[PDB]
Amino acid sequence: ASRILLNNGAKMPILGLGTWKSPPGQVTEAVKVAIDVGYRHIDCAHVYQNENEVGVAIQEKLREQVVKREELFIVSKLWCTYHEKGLVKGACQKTLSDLKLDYLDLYLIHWPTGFKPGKEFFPLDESGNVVPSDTNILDTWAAMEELVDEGLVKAIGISNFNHLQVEMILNKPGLKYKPAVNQIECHPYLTQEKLIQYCQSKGIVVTAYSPLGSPDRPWAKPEDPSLLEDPRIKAIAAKHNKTTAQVLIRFPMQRNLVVIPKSVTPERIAENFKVFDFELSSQDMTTLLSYNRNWRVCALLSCTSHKDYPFHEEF
Ligand SMILES: NC(=O)c1ccc[n+]([C@@H]2O[C@H](COP(=O)([O-])OP(=O)(O)OC[C@H]3O[C@@H](n4cnc5c(N)ncnc54)[C@H](OP(=O)(O)O)[C@@H]3O)[C@@H](O)[C@H]2O)c1
Ligand SMILES: O=C(O)CSc1nnc(-c2ccc([N+](=O)[O-])o2)o1
To answer: What distance in angstroms lies between residue 267's CA and the mean position of ligand 1's atoms?
Structure first.
């Protein structure tokens, strides 16, 4: 099916358009093209600095009646410098204003790590360590819960939370709403079997980010593995008469994940959506799972001493 049921009773499109690194000059057209070719979920974030332009596309397509608001599933994320309970509503409201929306379908805590509030997204001391916030995950969560109760967001969730941090929210005293989604990096080099099973066993839907391995990541290195160029994955694609990207997108779909490939290229936006017409075998799936090497696109080194840094733990 095209959507998965969340624990808030709403349905989430299992394919979304990513927007991290989408240049502000190209992302309006990218989102317009995506909605024209069937996408109904857009993944956004304030820290991506392009929500105004994403919003321009969404508003044009609503105005043109290409789509109804209820048919769209718009996701954004609370940045690290806004974990303070008094800053969360404003941060949500800024995103809503930029996206030109009156609600979000899903609002995520972008990272478990809270940073010192200010203009700077990564406030630094003088050695390059990020300056933390003394706010913890649970008070931030309560602030996310207020957003539901004020009508600004239909669902709340988390991102880059490890097993122990998901468990800490689930066990929060007085918990009012469980997280609906945990959005985490996931692809055949970082298969995440343990965290995904835990999350799904608790009724939390997992969204897979960087499913193509983020070839446009700013810190890429030549020696780095490349999913898109992996001859083993190309072979599975050839067998199925599909591209390597389409296999990489179908793979998490068949693990009951949501997946959010990014492109600003019209032809690739369309290609990436054409993944509902073929099936990977269980052997294919087990084969792709076997390529795991615990390789992460997203592990900022600048936050490794933060107390809530999520990736010291086995998962
Ligand atoms: N929660 C968080 O912490 C977090 C972290 C990372 C990512 N995410 C979200 O997840 C989304 C996806 O992750 P990502 O942006 O890191 O990378 P990705 O989706 O794995 O890869 C994007 C790269 O792949 C290229 N590409 C797209 N379709 C292609 C195709 N069919 N064939 C060949 N190349 C193709 C894109 O190029 P062009 O754009 O030039 O076409 C771009 O360089 C992000 O945009 C963001 O929305 C969330
Ligand atoms: O966040 C994205 O969507 C891409 S930009 C990014 N990558 N890694 C970070 C981050 C923030 C906190 C941590 N941390 O590792 O504690 O890492 O920000």
So the answer is: 14
- Determine whether the shortest distance from the Cβ of 228 to ligand 1 is under 6 A: yes
CA distance 289 to 193: 9
- What phi and psi values does residue 257 have, to the nearest 5 degrees? -105, 160
CA distance readout (Å), 186 to 55, 67, 213, 293: 27, 30, 9, 11
The reply to whether ligand 1 has any atom less than 6 angstroms from the CB of 262 is yes
Burial of 182-210, coded b for 16+ CB within 10 Å and e otherwise, reads bbbbbbbbbbbeebbebbeeeebbbbbbb
Return the ligand number nearest the Cα of 111: 2
- Which residues lie across from 18 on neighbouring strands? 262
| Cβ–ligand 2 contact at 80 (below 6 Å) | yes
Protein fold of 1-315:
TIM Barrel (3.20.20)
Q: Taking the C-alpha atoms of 178, 183, 184 and 185 in order, what is their torsion angle to the nearest 10 degrees?
A: 170
Residue 216 annotated as part of some ligand binding site: yes
Residue in the block written with tokens 């066990």: 171
CA–CA distance, 172 with 195 (Å, rounded to integer): 19
In the block, residue with structure tokens 């990272």:
111
247 annotated to bind ligand: yes
Token pair of 154, please? 């239909």
Give the method used: X-ray
Q: Facing residues of 3 across strands?
A: 13
Are 261 and 211 spatial neighbours (Cβ–Cβ below 8 Å)?
yes
